[PDB]
């Protein structure tokens, strides 16, 4: 449900209504639990982008 993605491979969308949301540039297979599986075109609610290298997404 909720994990880190690199932040490189998600693209943040402008922000509108509600909450902020990014999209899956690239497939990724989460390689560690604290990670989650996005496919590419994925539209992913954006929930911590604070870090640099690792953003907080939750996965549908």
């Known amino acids: 449900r909720q994990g880190f993605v690199?932040?490189?491979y998600v693209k943040?969308?402008?922000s509108g209504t509600?909450?902020?949301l990014v999209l899956a540039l690239y497939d990724y297979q989460?390689?560690?639990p604290r990670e989650v599986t996005m496919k590419?075109?994925?539209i992913l609610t954006?929930?911590?982008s604070t870090?640099?290298?690792w953003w907080?997404?939750?996965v549908n």
């Open 12 to 14: 943040k969308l402008d």
């Open 56 to 58: 907080k997404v939750e």
């Open 40 to 42: 590419k075109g994925d």
């Open 51 to 53: 870090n640099k290298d």
């Open 6 to 8: 690199p932040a490189a």
């Open 30 to 32: 989460e390689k560690s």
């Open 18 to 20: 509600g909450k902020e």
């Open 46 to 48: 954006l929930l911590n």
